[PDB]
Amino acid sequence: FRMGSISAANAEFCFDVFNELKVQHTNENILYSPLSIIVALAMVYMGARGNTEYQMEKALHFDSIQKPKCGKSVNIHLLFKELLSDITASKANYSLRIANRLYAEKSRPILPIYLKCVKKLYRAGLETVNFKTASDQARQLINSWVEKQTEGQIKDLLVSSSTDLDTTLVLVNAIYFKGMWKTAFNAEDTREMPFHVTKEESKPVQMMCMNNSFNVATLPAEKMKILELPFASGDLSMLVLLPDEVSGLERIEKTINFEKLTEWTNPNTMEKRRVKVYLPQMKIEEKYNLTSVLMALGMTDLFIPSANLTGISSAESLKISQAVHGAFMELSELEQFRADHPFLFLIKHNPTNTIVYFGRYWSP
Numbered sequence: 128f129r130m131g132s133i134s135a136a137n138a139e140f141c142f143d144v145f146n147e148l149k150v151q152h153t154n155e156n157i158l159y160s161p162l163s164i165i166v167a168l169a170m171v172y173m174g175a176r177g178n179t180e181y182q183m184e185k186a187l188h189f190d191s192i193q194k195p196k197c198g199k200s201v202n203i204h205l206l207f208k209e210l211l212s213d214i215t216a217s218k219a220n221y222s223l224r225i226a227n228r229l230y231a232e233k234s235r236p237i238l239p240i241y242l243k244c245v246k247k248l249y250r251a252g253l254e255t256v257n258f259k260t261a262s263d264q265a266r267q268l269i270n271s272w273v274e275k276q277t278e279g280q281i282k283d284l285l286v287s288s289s290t291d292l293d294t295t296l297v298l299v300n301a302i303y304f305k306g307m308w309k310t311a312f313n314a315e316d317t318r319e320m321p322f323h324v325t326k327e328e329s330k331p332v333q334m335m336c337m338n339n340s341f342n343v344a345t346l347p348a349e350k351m352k353i354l355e356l357p358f359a360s361g362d363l364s365m366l367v368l369l370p371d372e373v374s375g376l377e378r379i380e381k382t383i384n385f386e387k388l389t390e391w392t393n394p395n396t397m398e399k400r401r402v403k404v405y406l407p408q409m410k411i412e413e414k415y416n417l418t419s420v421l422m423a424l425g426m427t428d429l430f431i432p433s434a435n436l437t438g439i440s441s442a443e444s445l446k447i448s449q450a451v452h453g454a455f456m457e458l459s460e461l462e463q464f465r466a467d468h469p470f471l472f473l474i475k476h477n478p479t480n481t482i483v484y485f486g487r488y489w490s491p
């Protein structure tokens with residue numbers, strides 16, 4: 128299916144974003160959802176025209192994957208909708224929530240066709256609010272909604288300086304994940320161990336310990352191991368990319384991209400074997416203003432007054448004032464796999480190999 132094209136675009140976009148994010152987010156944890164971001168932008172893209180549309184099409188890698196009422200990319204919006212409904216369905220011991228919303232200044236009338244397309248393809252994804260004379264109340268309402276959707280974890284996503292009387296569009300995107308390990312780690316076996324941030328800096332961390340059969344890629348020439356950890360319920364799994372050397376992370380961050388990740392995680396390289404796993408208990412929250420990042424990736428017009436969103440509104444002045452992303456991830460409970468120094472990780476949707484979260488664990 129073309130779903131593989133959308134999965135590949137998401138991964139290519141994921142590493143485009145990582146390349147920008149790590150410039151400004153050095154020596155700290157990173158956590159974001161390329162999937163929820165690309166879906167948020169796809170919803171905007173549906174209403175973009177001219178150069179703004181062209182820039183988004185290239186930056187989102189849609190150009191590599193009788194006009195329909197919701198545009199030529201209607202098949203892409205449909206695939207995103209079907210994918211999101213799969214992974215956000217709540218199960219026992221599985222909670223993944225995505226909050227995705229474009230807020231529009233009420234004096235910019237929304238074209239009926241765009242409202243219809245959003246209702247069918249991105250339901251509840253568009254709201255009109257009075258930024259002009261109630262921008263601070265609108266901000267608190269938006270932040271409350273994000274806080275509610277993320278089970279209290281993503282607070283104050285839109286900071287006080289971010290909205291004013293001139294705000295016309297705000298793109299808000301948040302993702303929440305709380306999962307449980309398929310092999311429930313022994314409660315009487317998790318213990319406090321040193322996490323070696325560098326060879327010189329150590330911080331204590333609560334380490335989950337598991338001795339079980341896992342798929343693992345052992346790649347000496349790449350100086351890494353990659354462990355697959357299934358979740359208890361749902362169709363998601365975590366991959367952990369552990370550098371062999373204590374500070375081997377930078378070398379891997381310099382070279383990783385979609386093609387390399389595919390080579391390193393090739394099912395032919397994966398072997399099912401008994402592994403003694405030490406993994407830090409992970410509870411990571413990160414918030415990003417993605418405006419600069421997305422402009423640097425080539426979507427400049429979307430965030431300045433020459434934005435062309437005339438598929439959203441006919442109004443004279445429209446642009447995205449802020450694109451903000453909040454991500455929360457929590458996990459709770461032979462060859463060695465001792466993740467006690469900085470590493471990369473991702474959460475993927477197994478049926479489609481789509482990357483849902485990508486991140487760096489730098490320090491407890």
Ligand SMILES: CO[C@H]1O[C@H](COS(=O)(=O)O)[C@@H](O[C@@H]2O[C@@H](C(=O)O)[C@@H](O[C@H]3O[C@H](COS(=O)(=O)O)[C@@H](O[C@@H]4O[C@H](C(=O)O)[C@@H](O[C@H]5O[C@H](COS(=O)(=O)O)[C@@H](O)[C@H](O)[C@H]5NS(=O)(=O)O)[C@H](O)[C@H]4O)[C@H](OS(=O)(=O)O)[C@H]3NS(=O)(=O)O)[C@H](O)[C@H]2OS(=O)(=O)O)[C@H](O)[C@H]1NS(=O)(=O)O
Nearest residue numbers: 175176177178179180181182184193194198199200437438
């Ligand atoms: C580097 O960037 C620069 O170049 C790129 C690349 O373009 S290039 O290869 O030509 O060099 C530019 O990006 C491309 O162009 C964009 C753009 O021109 O807006 C954009 O194209 C998409 O949006 C166009 C505008 O849509 S609209 O709704 O805002 O009007 C659209 O063109 C229009 O299509 C409609 C249509 O067919 O529905 C036309 O409407 C008219 O025809 C209908 C019936 O047709 S019929 O044959 O007579 O029966 C009527 O129902 C309708 O009433 C009627 N309206 S009327 O006012 O004209 O009378 C309309 O005339 C067209 O202008 C594009 O559709 S297309 O089929 O004509 O190509 C649409 N392309 S799509 O999304 O791919 O399907 C895109 O961003 C991009 O298009 S591309 O093909 O992907 O490359 C970029 O703008 C430019 N930037 S710049 O340098 O800064 O300027």
